[PDB]
Structures are given as structure tokens and as C-alpha cells.
Paper text:
Sorbicillinoids are yellow secondary metabolites synthesized through an elegant combination of enzymatic and spontaneous biochemical processes. The flavin-dependent monooxygenase SorC and oxidase [name] are crucial in this interplay, enabling the generation of a diverse array of functionally complex sorbicillinoids. SorA and SorB work in tandem to synthesize the hexaketide precursor sorbicillin, while SorC and [name] are involved in the subsequent oxidative processes, including dimerization and oxidation reactions.11,12 Specifically, the monooxygenase SorC catalyzes the oxidative dearomatization of sorbicillin to form (S)-sorbicillinol. The oxidase [name] can then use hydrated sorbicillinol and oxidize it to oxosorbicillinol.
The C-terminally His6-tagged [name] from Penicillium chrysogenum ATCC 48,271 was produced in Aspergillus niger following a CRISPR/Cas9-based expression method. [name] crystallized as a monomer, consistent with size-exclusion chromatography and mass photometry. [name] belongs to the vanillyl-alcohol oxidase/p-cresol methylhydroxylase (VAO/PCMH) family and more specifically to the berberine bridge enzyme (BBE) subfamily. As with other oxidases from the VAO/PCMH family, the general structure of [name] contains two domains (1.55 Å): the N-terminal FAD domain (residues 45–212) and the C-terminal substrate-binding domain (residues 213–435). [name] also comprises a short C-terminal BBE domain (residues 436–468). The structure contains the partial remains of the N-terminal signal peptide (residues 5–22), and five N-glycosylation sites were identified (Asn18, Asn29, Asn174, Asn279, and Asn351). Several members of the BBE subfamily are characterized by (bi)covalent incorporation of the flavin cofactor. This feature was also found in [name], where the FAD is covalently attached to residue His78. Covalent tethering of the flavin cofactor in BBE-like oxidases allows for a rather open active site that facilitates the entry of such bulky substrates. Moreover, upon testing the thermostability of [name], we found that the enzyme is more stable under acidic conditions, with the highest melting temperature of 66 °C observed at pH 4.5.
Author numbering: 5 to 470
Amino acid sequence: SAFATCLLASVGGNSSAVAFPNQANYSTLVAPYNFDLLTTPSAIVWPQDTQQVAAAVKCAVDSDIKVQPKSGGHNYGNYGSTTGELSVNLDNLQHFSMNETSWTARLGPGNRLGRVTELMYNNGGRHVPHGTTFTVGLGGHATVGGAGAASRMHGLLLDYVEEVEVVLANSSIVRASKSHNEDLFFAVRGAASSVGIVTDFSIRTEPVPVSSVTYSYIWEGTDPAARAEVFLTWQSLLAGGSLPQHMAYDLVATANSMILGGAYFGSQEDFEAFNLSSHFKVAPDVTHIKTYTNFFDFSAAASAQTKAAGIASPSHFYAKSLVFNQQTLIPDDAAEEVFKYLATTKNGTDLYAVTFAALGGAVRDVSASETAFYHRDASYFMFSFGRTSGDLTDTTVQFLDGLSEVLTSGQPDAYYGQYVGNVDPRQPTDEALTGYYGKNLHRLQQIKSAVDPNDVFHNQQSIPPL
Ligand SMILES: *Cc1cc2c(cc1C)nc1c(=O)[nH]c(=O)nc-1n2C[C@H](O)[C@H](O)[C@H](O)COP(=O)(O)OP(=O)(O)OC[C@H]1O[C@@H](n2cnc3c(N)ncnc32)[C@H](O)[C@@H]1O
Ligand SMILES: *[C@@H]1O[C@H](CO)[C@@H](O[C@@H]2O[C@H](CO)[C@@H](O[C@H]3O[C@H](CO[C@H]4O[C@H](CO)[C@@H](O)[C@H](O)[C@@H]4O)[C@@H](O)[C@H](O)[C@@H]3O)[C@H](O)[C@H]2NC(C)=O)[C@H](O)[C@H]1NC(C)=O
Ligand SMILES: *[C@@H]1O[C@H](CO)[C@@H](O[C@@H]2O[C@H](CO)[C@@H](O)[C@H](O)[C@H]2NC(C)=O)[C@H](O)[C@H]1NC(C)=O
Ligand SMILES: *[C@@H]1O[C@H](CO)[C@@H](O[C@@H]2O[C@H](CO)[C@@H](O)[C@H](O)[C@H]2NC(C)=O)[C@H](O)[C@H]1NC(C)=O
Ligand SMILES: *[C@@H]1O[C@H](CO)[C@@H](O)[C@H](O)[C@H]1NC(C)=O
Ligand SMILES: *[C@@H]1O[C@H](CO)[C@@H](O)[C@H](O)[C@H]1NC(C)=O
């Protein structure tokens, strides 16, 4: 086809840097993360640099094909491999350099977070707040938000993004920053996937913490009332404002445990002195506290823990998200109903996790309207994850759907955000857009119309032009 010819030329005739349906191994090359929502892109291309990205986009445009990039491939709907669209695989764009005058790093989108973490540490003992899973790609992560262990302390990853290079739908290459193409910069910091392909990032850094203390307190058992009590305490201690601003603080419910976990940036002695578990009516069954003098080790261990938990690998699953704030905190009775629901509902899973992850702190230092990330006044995220041994069934979809309903049952008609970093393809696109972007939606549609009127950069739940 013209498309195939064009697209081979976009990578300089390197036939290893393009793949088409009907090539051997195509479904493996697509590399699904979610194993249920398998896709067949019209082609996959592996550009070497920005120019080849721009060339490949043009090939799609010339053949009336739409485009998504793929960096780490962690999208929960495999949207970076959308069916019938060009998948621009950015695995080759993994450059890294450190400006030691400012400790600002310049990095390609194909860097996965484990490499980002290693290279920032090695280049002068630096880091930036980001997520905990090492296989997440920077390209899709810095462009949605990027919340992790250091976020209460320092904010989102995208709060450290100072400049980007972006390939636009017409194959123009631009830069964006707070001082230049400010509108594009707004959209890239939380909604890049709808407006262009980020081919380079300049990211400010912080010195690593001197001391990083991981904690984990576990309550074992299946009693819904006991579990609700742990949740309610967890929620009220967060809402009360007594927690140290810098400390990561999360609660994970599984079928047989509640795990209060996080990170404290200070001495183990000072952490232990704070006596976090004393606020709970029932003492945890297990406490694990570990100090890391090396921040790379801390980060590697955090990544290894989520992988070991079974919730961080390509798999069959469904997953949903919600944002809660001081105005939508879950009432006592609804929390009781949440844990009753988890206790008795037929779930179809081989594993589930319901994660409550505190935000606040430095995340709130930036206003909702300053970047495309809307949820700045959030108290916490709720992420639900239901893994299955074989193909997903409606049992598990209904399970998570009904869970979101009971979680919001204290105030069913209030606004609830969703994190666009954890896409939920099994809902109306209208509800998704409203959840993902909130009142930033209108401005994003304006920018979409400005930079991509023909909707080249499209997925199931992308921002539509006006
Ligand atoms: C899989 C996963 C995700 C995850 C997580 C744990 C796991 C196991 N833990 C997270 C956490 O602790 N904190 C957080 O903030 N997010 C966490 N996530 C979610 C992760 O941030 C998102 O899934 C993120 O978007 C993944 O990025 P990645 O780069 O790996 O994924 P992708 O499928 O290739 O892309 C996602 C979407 O963004 C678009 N994209 C990709 N690259 C670009 C560039 N360069 N420019 C513009 N858009 C880009 C894709 O097209 C897709 O729509
Ligand atoms: C609500 O969700 C619960 C959580 O998923 C459901 O329980 C789960 O039920 C499945 C199916 O019965 C069960 O499957 C696994 O059980 C064996 C033991 O677990 C192994 O898991 C690790 C890997 O994760 C494995 O490497 C270890 O050897 C470990 O022993 C497995 O051998 C088997 O192949 C299968 O994977 C889950 O264990 C079970 N989870 C728990 C912790 O209970 C529950 O059924 C559901 N309830 C309702 C009402 O629907
Ligand atoms: C031809 O294209 C392929 C794909 O881009 C290139 O192979 C990759 O090379 C990198 C090293 O630069 C390896 O780490 C990857 O595993 C390869 N990616 C694949 C196979 O998808 C190859 O270098 C290119 N040849 C050139 C540029 O002459
Ligand atoms: C390709 O599209 C971009 C984005 O619409 C165009 O850039 C804009 O051009 C208008 C009018 O000149 C400016 O007001 C905007 O500030 C530009 N936006 C950017 C750069 O983000 C660009 O001109 C188009 N290129 C071609 C050759 O048509
Ligand atoms: C496809 O993958 C298999 C297994 O990984 C490999 O042995 C084979 O050489 C691949 N085929 C092609 C045409 O690359
Ligand atoms: C923490 O609080 C509990 C009471 O809930 C108390 O028994 C324990 O001694 C305290 N631990 C400290 C401060 O080391």
C-alpha cells in the first residue's frame, strides 16, 4: 500500500523498524498490557528520532489513518496500540543527559521509570517524584500526572517538566514551556495523548532524601466491620491534617488483608516515634519497617513489591479509579457497605486490590487550572484492580462497577474524578472525559481544535475537537 511504502521510508528503509498485520509475530509485537482488550494496529513503527516520528505521522495522515504513540505500553485499554491506527512505538527514544548546572535532565519518552530512576541517581544523586513501577514509560507517565512515594513531598512528575518537544498532527515540530506555546504546554501536562507526540522532556530534579523509610502495617482477616474500621480511621487521620506533609500514605484492601503502607523521608527513629499504628482501634497483626540509605535501592524495592503483589504485570484484568476530596469523603455507613460488598459479591477474580493513595501535600501547590491534571484538591485516589486467571468475564466487570457505585453511595450525584493514568474503557466516553479532565475539559477541547482539528491523535476516550 502507499501507507506501507511511506511508512518504510519514514524509518529509512529499515524493515525491522516497521511491522504490519499479517507479519509473523504481529500480535506479540503489539505487546498488549491488558490481555482482554487485544488490538490490531494498522501498523507499528519504531522511529529513531523526532524527524522519523514526524515522518511517520505524515504517512498516517496521508492515508487517513489516526495515530497513537506508545512509550511503556502500560495503558489499561492498550490505547497506544489502538486498532486500525498507527502505533508509534518510542522504544528507541531513550536518550538521557544531565545539565549539572541546574540538575535538569533531558530525557526521551522511551525511558522506563527504572532507567529514569537509575540515571537520575547516578548523575549527581537526583530524583523526581514519579510512580513506583519500573516498567512504566516516561512518555505516557509524565503526560498524565505521575504520582508516587515522593508526591506529597514534591508534587507530580509533571510539576517538574520544564519543557517538551512535541510532534504535531501536521508533522510540525514545536517546543512548549510555561513561557512558550503555553496552551500546548498545559495540554501536554495531563492530556498529551490527545494533542501530539512528546519526543523529548526537560525535567527538573531534587536531591534524593538522606533517609527513606518504608512501612507496612497488616491486618489479616475477612471481617467487613473490622476492615471498614481500618479504612475509616485511615480516612479520618488523613483528613485531620496531622500527618507529616512529606510522608506517603496508602491503604490496600485485598480479600484477606488490609495493608497500611507508605514512605517516610526521615529517620526510622522519628518515624517509629510518630507511632502511626497507635491511631487504630485494633493493632495490626504485622509491622514491617525498613530504612534505605540508598534511594535507588528504596525505589527498586518499591517496584519489586508491587510486581510481587501480582497487580503490576501484563495480565487479564479490569480496573477502575475514583478521586475523593474533603467534600466527598466516604461516610461511615457507606464504608461499612463497601466492605460488606467486597466480602460477599461474586467477583470472578484470582486476585483483587482496592488501593487508597493519599494525595495532598505538594500536589495541591499547583492549581487545577494550571495544568491539564484537574484533581489538585484530591484527598486520595481509589484504584480498584481485579485480575482473572483466564479471559475476563462480566462477573468481574460487574464486580468493579458495583464497587464504584457503593464507594460513591454516600453522595451519589457529587463530582468524582478519575485518573486518566488508569484508563477505564468500560464506561461512556462522556463519563470518562468528565472524570478524567473535569472543568479543564472545555479548554482542552479548544486546544485540541487549535492543534489537531482533524483528530489525528485519537483513542477511545481522547479529547474531541469542539
Ligand atoms: C501499568 C501500571 C500503571 C501505573 C502504575 C502501575 C502499573 C502496573 N502505577 C502508577 C503509579 O504509581 N502512579 C501513577 O501516576 N501512574 C501509575 N500507573 C499509570 C501510568 O502512569 C499510566 O498508565 C501511564 O500513562 C503509562 O505510560 P506508558 O508510557 O507506560 O503507557 P503507554 O500505554 O505507552 O501510553 C499511555 C497513553 O499516553 C500516550 N503516550 C505515550 N507516550 C506518549 C508520548 N510520548 N507523547 C504523548 N502521549 C504519549 C499513549 O498513546 C496512551 O494514550
Ligand atoms: C473474591 O476475590 C478473591 C480474591 O481474588 C477470590 O479468591 C481467590 O480465588 C481464586 C480462585 O478460587 C484463588 O486462586 C488461586 O488459588 C491458588 C493459591 O494461591 C496462589 O497464588 C499465588 C499467585 O498469586 C501462587 O503463586 C501461590 O502458590 C498461591 O498459593 C492457586 O494455586 C490457584 O492456581 C489460583 O491462582 C485465589 O487464591 C483466591 N485468593 C484469595 C487470597 O483468597 C474469591 O474467590 C472471591 N470471592 C467471591 C465471593 O467471589
Ligand atoms: C533497525 O530498526 C530496529 C528497530 O528500531 C533497530 O533495532 C533496535 O535496536 C536497538 C538498539 O539501538 C535494540 O535495543 C532494540 O532491541 C531494537 N529494536 C527492535 C528490534 O524493535 C535497529 O537498530 C535499526 N537499524 C539501524 C538503525 O540501522
Ligand atoms: C501545524 O499546526 C500548528 C498547530 O496548529 C501550527 O502552529 C500554530 O500556528 C498558529 C498560526 O500561525 C499560531 O498562532 C500558533 O501559535 C501555532 N501553534 C503552535 C505552534 O503550537 C503550524 O503553523 C502548522 N504548520 C503548518 C506548516 O501548517
Ligand atoms: C517470532 O518469535 C519466535 C519466538 O520468539 C522466534 O523464534 C521467531 O524467530 C520469530 N519470527 C520472526 C519471523 O521474527
Ligand atoms: C504506640 O502506641 C501504643 C498505644 O496505641 C502504645 O502501646 C505503644 O507503646 C506506643 N509505642 C511507642 C510510642 O513506641
